[PDB]
Structure formats: C-alpha cells, structure tokens
Symmetry: D3
Subunit: 157 residues, 6 copies
C-alpha cells in the first residue's frame, strides 16, 4: 500500500485542509489525518470536537482515516507504516519554516514531505484567522465545512 | 468622495507610518487613520497618547482625520463610508501574511487593500524595533516624529 | 480629480488585469490603462488589437480610458495629470523587482505605486503563460475576457 | 496503481533530480520521467543522450520508466494514466513560478503537483549552473551521476 | 586588526553556529562570540553552561574568544573595538527581519552585518528545533557539537 | 593579510556598488574589485571604460585595487590569494540565486561569500535599471558616481 499522513492541529479544520485531504486521498492508497494538539491548553475546540469535525467533513473519502497523533510527527508516520507527509501551501504559509521542518523530518526518520498548493478559493483561510474573524463577528462560512460552521454558530449564539 | 483608511496600532507612530499617511492623503480625497489597540494590555503608550502622537504628527495633512477603531478593520472601513485600506511595506514586513489578510478582508466585506513601499530612509523602522532599541538606550530619533521623540525622552529621563 | 494609471503590455489582457482595472476604477475618479509595447517586435497581438481587447473588456467601467503609452511610465503618468500607478500582484509576480521599479519611479518623478492582490480565481493567469498554454492547445478561456477568447480562437482555427 | 510523472529537460540530469526520482519511486507504484525538450535548439545534449543518461542513472529504480514528453505536461501526464506531477525544490528554485504553473496545471487538467525538498547536499546543483561551471573548467562531479560525468569529461577532453 | 562579532543566544550552540564561527575566524583577525541571553528566564541552559558549550566547541579556533554580551549588540560590538557582525543564513531564517535589524544596526552605530550561508548539512538545525526534537525523543546528535550532545543526554537520562 | 574580492560586470558601477566597496574596504586589509565581462558583446561600456569608472569612483579607498577577472570567479579569488567574496543585497536582488551561487562557489573552491545590505538610499539602483531609465531620458545622477554621470551624459548629448 502507498500511504500518506496529513498532520495538523485542525482547530478547526478548514476547507483548505479538506482540499489537501482530497488530493492526498486521490494519490495515495491510504491517508491518515493526524490530529496533533497543543502542548499547553490553548485551543478553541477540544480534541473530541476536532476529531468529530474532521470525520464529518471527510465522509466522502473512504480511504481516509482520522487518528490522534502523539510525539514527533515522524514517529506517528512510521507507526502508521508510512514514510510520507502531505501538507498544503496557502497564502500566509511560512514556507521557509515548512522547508526546515521537512529537512529535519527527513534527517531524523527518513520521512518525505510532499507539499501541494491549496485551491485558490481556499488559499487564504487558516484556522487561526478563521477563528479571529469569527470571534470578531465576521462571516467565514464559505471557507469552512458545514460540520465546522454548525459548531462555530453554536459557540456564538 | 474617494477615501482610504490607514489602520494600525501605532505604538508609537513612526516616520514610516507618516510617509504612508502622506501618500494616502495625496491620492484619496479623505484619509482616516484608524488606531486599533491590543486585545490585551500590552502597549507602551495608552490610547489617548497614541491618538495625540498621530494628530500632532499629521497637522500638515488637512484631509486626514484620526479615530479609534473597533472590531474588524473592514467593519470600521465600511463605517467610514469607504472600501479601501492603505498599508505600507517595509523591510521586515511579513508580506505573505499581509496578502492573506488582504484576501480575507476582500472576501468578507469587499474591501480592497492597496500596498505602498515606504520611503527607503524610513524602511527599517517599526514601532516594535524602535521601542526595543529606545529601551536599550539607542537613538532612533531620526526615525520618529518629534511629537513621539518628546514623549519617548520623557519616559527615559 | 483623483486618478491612477494601470500600465502594462497587455498581450493579451487577462481577467487578472481586468480585476485590477475594476479595483482602480472603484477607488479613483479616473483610470487610464496605459498600453506600453515591446521595444522590439516580439508580441502576439499588434497594438491596435491590444487596444481593442482592453476597450471591449472594460465597457462596464465608464471612468476608465485606454491610451498607448510612450517612454518612461512615470512620464506618461505625469502627462495624464496623475501621480499614481496601480498594479496587481499575482502568483508568480516577481515582487522584489516590482518594489525596485516602484522605488525608482518614486525617485525620478515622485510617482507612487499602489499594489493590490488579484482575486484568487485570477491569480495564476499571466499573458505569457496564457499564450504558452493556448499555443500548446490548452483551455484558458475561463481566465481571459471573451473579447480575447474570440481573437485567440481565430488565430488557432 | 498510484503513479507520478517527474518532468524536466534534464540537460543533463543531476543528482538533485535523481534524489527526487528516488523519493517519487518510494511513494508511488509507478514513476515516469518525462523528458521535455527545448522548443528551439539550445541544449548541450541531444535527446538521445539525455534519455541514456537518465536511464543509466536510475537502474536501481525498477518501478521507474523514462519517456520523451510532448506538448503540455498535463496532457502527457494524463496520457500516462496519471494525475500527479512530482517536482523538486532546491536553492535557487523560483518557487512563485512553480506555484503559478502548478495552479495552471490543476486548472486546465485537474493534475496535482507535489513538491519535495531536495537533499541538502544536492540542493545547489542545477543543470544550467553545472554546465556553466563545467564549461569554465570547474569540478561538479560530486553533484552529477557517473553516467553524466563520463559524458561531460568526453566533451572537454 | 580586523575583527567580527558573532552574536546569538546559543541555547544551545549548534554545528550551524560553529560553521559560521569557522568562516568568521578564517576571514577576520579576531572573532568574538557574544552570548546575548533572554530578557526573561526562558532558556534551557543557563549562561554558564552556554559559555562552556561554545568554548568546548571552538578549541580549534585560536583567534576566537567567547564573552557574555549586554545591551544593544552594536554597543557590545563597539566595546570590542569592532564594527562588524557576522551572522549565518539557514533554512528557516527570517531574512526580511535579519535585513531590518542589519539596517537598524548600521543606522544607530555604523556597524556592518555580513551574512554567510550555512553549510548545507547544517542548514536545517536551529537551537529551538533541536531542543524541540530532543525533548520529544528524536536524535539530532549529528547536528550538534559533542560538548552539547553530552549535556543534552544528561538532561534526559 | 585579510582580503575580499568584489566581483561584478559594473556596466556601469553604481553608488550601490561603491557602498559595498567601502564596507569591504573597512573590514578587510585588501579589496580587489573584479570586473567580469559578458561572454558575448552586450554591454554599454567597454572594459576599458568600466575599469576607469571604478578607479575614478574609488580614489578614496587606498586598500582597494581594480582588476579584470577571467573564468570562474572562485579561480580569480584564489589567484588573488584570497578566499572571500563580498556582495551587496539590494531591492530586486534574486537572493535565492545568490545563495545557490554562494553554495556552489564554496563547494568547488572553498570560497566563502559574505552578503551585506546596501544603504537604503542606494538600494533600488542597478546597472541595468539605471541604463534603462537613462536611455529613456530619466535622471539617475543621484544614484551613480560623478565619473559615471559624466560618461553617461556624453553618450546622450
Ligand atoms: C502538527 C505540525 C505538523 C504542524 O501543526 P499545525 O498546528 O497544524 O501548524 P500549521 O501548519 O497550521 O501552522 C500554523 C501554526 O503556527 C503557529 N503560529 C503561531 N503564530 C504564528 C505566526 N505568527 N506565524 C506562523 N505560525 C504561527 C500556530 O500555533 C499555528 O497553529 P495555530 O496558530 O492554529 O495554533 C507540527 O507542529 C508537528 O509536527 N508537531 C509534532 C511535533 C514534531 O514532530 N516536531 C518536530 C517538527 S520538525
Ligand atoms: C490593525 C491591523 C490592520 C494591523 O495592526 P498593527 O498592529 O499595526 O500591525 P503591524 O502591521 O504593525 O504588524 C506588526 C504586528 O505584528 C505582531 N507581531 C508580533 N510579533 C511579530 C513577529 N515576530 N513578526 C511579525 N509580526 C509580529 C505585533 O503585535 C506587531 O505589532 P506590534 O509588534 O507593534 O505589537 C490588524 O491587526 C487588524 O486589522 N486588526 C483588527 C481586527 C481584524 O480586522 N482582524 C481580521 C484581519 S483579516
Ligand atoms: C509596462 C511596465 C510597467 C510593465 O509591463 P508589463 O509588460 O505588463 O510587465 P508584467 O508586469 O506583465 O511583467 C511580466 C514581464 O516580464 C518580462 N519577463 C520575461 N521573462 C520573465 C521571467 N522569466 N520572469 C518575470 N518576468 C519576465 C516579460 O516581458 C513580461 O511581459 P511578457 O512576458 O508578457 O512579455 C514596465 O515595463 C514599464 O514601466 N515600462 C515603461 C518603461 C519604464 O518606465 N521603465 C523604467 C521602469 S522603473
Ligand atoms: C518541463 C517543465 C515542467 C519544466 O522544465 P525544466 O526545463 O526542467 O525547468 P526547470 O525546473 O529546470 O527550470 C529551469 C528552467 O528555467 C529556465 N530559465 C532560464 N533562465 C532562467 C532564470 N534566470 N531563472 C529561472 N529559470 C530560468 C531555463 O530554461 C531552465 O532550464 P534550463 O535553464 O536548464 O534550460 C515545463 O517547462 C513544462 O511543463 N513544459 C511543457 C509545456 C507546458 O506544459 N507548459 C505549461 C506549463 S503551466
Ligand atoms: C542576539 C541577536 C543578534 C539574535 O539572537 P538569537 O537569539 O541567536 O536569534 P536567532 O538568530 O537564533 O533567531 C531566532 C530567535 O527568534 C525568536 N523567535 C521566536 N519565535 C520565532 C519564530 N516563530 N520565528 C522566528 N524567530 C522566532 C526566538 O527567540 C529565537 O531564539 P530562540 O527561538 O532560540 O529563543 C539579537 O537578539 C540581538 O541583537 N540582541 C541584542 C539586543 C539588540 O541589539 N537589539 C536591537 C537589534 S536591531
Ligand atoms: C560576476 C558575477 C559574480 C555576477 O556578475 P554581475 O554581472 O555583476 O551580476 P549582478 O549581480 O549584477 O546580477 C544581475 C545580472 O543578472 C543578469 N540578469 C539578466 N536578466 C535578469 C533578470 N531578469 N533578473 C535578474 N538578473 C538578470 C544580468 O545580466 C545582470 O547583469 P546585467 O543585467 O547588468 O547584465 C557572476 O556572473 C560570476 O561569478 N561570473 C563568473 C563566472 C562564474 O564563476 N560562474 C559560476 C558562478 S557559481
């Protein structure tokens, strides 16, 4: 089997992330979305909620599974019997840092990182900015999956 | 009327900012400098002081006014009856993040962002770096308006 | 009157360019599209055709006019009684070179350059790449105005 | 089958390219190296020589094949029954242009592009720079496959 | 005497840093490594330990000395009777910010900054990332001097 | 002796280049400006004129000498008994390509490259852009040494 891991904090998952999941699922036999949480309580959604949002947003991808990650991403990737990470590039991505992490990840565990450009319509959403705008009252519903929109609306109502 | 908003925390306003104010005032019928403060108390100058410093530094621009901003910048821009933001680019600007915010701002409110390169002599000052250097004893008086220099000198004397 | 010039070779004009024209026309009282041609015969469309394509693509912008430019862009801008250039940023833009030209243009003639991020859907088209793909048989009709599509199809039929 | 195409002019193939071939072959069931030549005679090695150099440099990759490409890369990719391109990133890569081409390629044919960072030791070689240095008398043998070194040495002896 | 200062927090010193020390020592008569610590207790190693690690890692450079820095780096540089800073560039370096600091440092004290590209094999290590990986259990021993490896291993055993 | 080479085509030398010469001469015992000309006749000024312009512009730097370079820059550097190149960074510099060349130069000859940020006032001039503007009638006299201005004015009169 070919396979890739798509790691992130997904707090919450965006349509930018889902686009990347779809591309990974199209090109690898199996995809694992690895939810890697904050070292210190700082998130908007708890882990259970993050998991549910990813699952509910990926029902159309039968070769994708969702799991909570622990420790070094490369250790999680190798625990999945894989050697590839797939990550998206968007507007605002710190690409130099992504490159540094990719080189470090290859050095320590031989894990490759494949980068893919997110679809233009979803290229300016990030979890952080979506939350920031949502919390100040703005509408980002067109940039997030409906399972995320539902939960966001509940927190503000 | 044509018009633009120049948003920032201006803590304190620099000659880099003033350069941008001048360019905006030269090209739009009206300019509003929007002072948008920290979500959490972290600034050097209080809001009243920031306002005074901007006003005192822009007496030569009769079509410019200064107001405190609240909430999403785009909501403030639209409250001013405008649809444009003017921002400066300098050495050290995270341009990828500026682009992300501009695209998000256009998405949520149809507000355009126009970027302009700050004058070379003022292209390496930032509020943060100016404060950092000032607090460690260095001289940045040539990079800040005199109304700011006066107040800075008072805090150290 | 406020006013801006939108300079380019427009060979041919793209929907990326038209997006920028629209933003300029929304924020300035008058816009002049300045068609500045090759120093040496190298273009796909002659000047007459470039002019027609821009005009036919901008009939919805009553405060926009199209003229052929000559010499330094800044000299043309000043001949229009203006002091501002508006240019788009897209994926693939050499932003460092754009900044260099903007600083040079300000130095020699006091002309300001305002940069605006092109709409995501039109952020990866360029005249060159559109021609390259079109000539190799690919479909970029969704990235160009219909007046350009008509003429392109004629050259290949 | 999963599969990826690795397109390039490979004039000549470098160890940077071979590194990318190896990563693609590790993660996809099949890899096709597509040699896409100059629209106008400008190369150092003819097509037959380029093909031989790639083949001789990839004997250790049994799931990799080499073919000459024609027309749009995306048309070649789809002719291979694939929907993915794998490309390397190195020091000196114009990443903005790579992104533009990737977005265009996805737009016109639905083909995804996966980018991977080349190994540090091979991150500063390019075909052009290798030729430039080789022609001026410098030693780049540690940056090129032996099948390429042999042929290079023959051209200078 | 010609001379340069190599400033940093060195928490801990990496082989990337040592590479830069070596290049500085090769090109200047004297080199001073200036250890500039956190304004607030946040480091892994105390100052005494940082000093020892640098000294033990540079025994092969007889024209290099190690000192603790205080205040503005430029003030320290001038206190050493020098007017040059040498800094490394690696993968992940925020080069725009480095440029801003260099321009500010030249403005306030006339101190020049010379940047040098770190050796490829050491181009993806940083003190922060090395600690992050080390603390999560990963092996970065090939990226750090043995005097640092010894101390790291002691903290985890 | 410490020493550095400052290589370039200098067609013509700009005040940006002279700024870099001055910084090199301040930090190294000896500086050699190496004029490396076009592989094919394409320049505005012949080699004799380029040499004269550099010499006449550097009379205030007694530890600087001017020589015509041949072949690989690293071979010229080593022929000068040196192992360092000093190059400027300005607005518009392709820094990724500079890094690639620096890494290649270190690989083939062990020669280090030190980069320094050009003074802001001279950060947007380049030989090419200066010629382009000069030829179209614009005034760049404030960006070039008087010995260059004299010769430029002669070509247009
Ligand atoms: C999970 C992992 C791949 C990236 O996770 P991610 O949280 O999805 O990160 P993203 O790509 O969204 O990057 C944005 C993150 O940068 C951090 N960040 C904070 N401020 C930032 C800023 N101003 N600019 C850029 N990034 C910022 C944020 O935490 C942000 O997540 P958040 O802002 O939503 O909290 C990575 O953290 C990881 O591998 N973790 C496991 C540990 C490991 O292996 N470490 C060694 C890596 S070499
Ligand atoms: C006001 C606004 C336009 C930008 O404000 P600003 O404070 O002037 O920001 P600047 O352009 O100076 O950016 C620098 C800011 O980045 C933040 N920053 C902190 N560390 C940083 C770092 N290492 N690198 C870059 N930026 C950093 C800083 O807070 C800094 O301001 P400060 O450092 O002086 O406190 C923006 O915050 C805003 O729009 N706020 C309103 C809310 C809104 O609309 N949000 C949605 C935006 S899409
Ligand atoms: C008109 C002007 C503003 C820009 O014109 P433009 O042709 O629309 O340029 P773009 O922004 O589309 O830039 C792309 C151009 O870069 C040139 N280019 C060629 N190869 C390129 C490459 N590999 N990468 C980037 N650009 C490339 C191309 O000619 C391209 O136009 P084309 O490829 O479609 O022919 C500018 O040329 C100008 O001002 N000209 C007048 C003279 C002047 O004032 N000069 C002094 C300027 S400081
Ligand atoms: C094959 C293809 C994927 C890239 O091919 P490549 O030749 O290996 O290109 P590289 O990634 O090595 O890019 C370097 C190329 O940039 C060109 N280039 C020239 N000067 C350059 C410069 N100063 N800077 C950067 N690139 C330069 C060079 O030709 C160079 O190849 P070469 O210099 O060795 O001749 C692409 O050309 C392609 O897809 N061609 C088929 C046609 C197509 O589909 N077109 C539409 C694309 S959206
Ligand atoms: C010492 C000095 C030259 C740089 O020191 P340094 O700590 O070695 O900094 P580096 O080059 O390693 O930069 C990385 C630093 O950026 C800071 N940083 C934090 N988060 C970061 C992020 N997400 N991205 C980039 N940098 C980050 C970190 O603190 C990091 O050091 P650390 O992460 O290991 O703690 C500079 O701080 C200095 O000059 N200090 C003296 C005061 C002075 O003169 N100030 C005026 C400067 S103009
Ligand atoms: C001399 C040398 C150090 C750089 O020389 P330089 O001509 O001063 O180059 P610059 O730093 O000014 O770079 C700009 C050059 O890029 C070339 N260039 C052309 N179009 C360009 C573009 N669109 N963008 C960027 N650069 C461009 C130009 O020729 C330009 O010089 P010019 O435009 O004035 O003719 C380098 O060419 C060299 O080392 N030559 C000797 C041979 C060698 O050692 N080769 C192996 C190098 S690893």
């Amino acid at each position: 089997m070919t396979g890739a891991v798509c790691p992130g904090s997904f707090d919450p998952v965006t349509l930018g992330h889902v686009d990347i999941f779809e591309r990974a699922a199209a090109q690898f036999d199996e995809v694992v979305v690895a939810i890697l949480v904050n070292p210190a309580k700082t998130g908007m959604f708890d882990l259970d909620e993050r998991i549910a949002m990813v699952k509910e947003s990926t029902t159309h991808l039968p070769n994708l599974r969702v799991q909570v990650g622990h420790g070094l991403v490369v250790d999680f990737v190798r625990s999945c019997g894989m050697t590839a990470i797939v990550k998206g590039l968007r507007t605002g991505t710190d690409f130099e840092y992504e490159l540094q992490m990719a080189q470090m990840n290859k050095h320590i565990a031989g894990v490759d990182t494949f980068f893919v450009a997110t679809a233009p319509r979803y290229s300016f959403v990030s979890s952080s900015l979506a939350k920031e705008v949502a919390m100040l009252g703005g509408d980002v519903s067109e940039l997030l999956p409906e399972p995320v929109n539902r939960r966001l609306r509940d927190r503000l109502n």
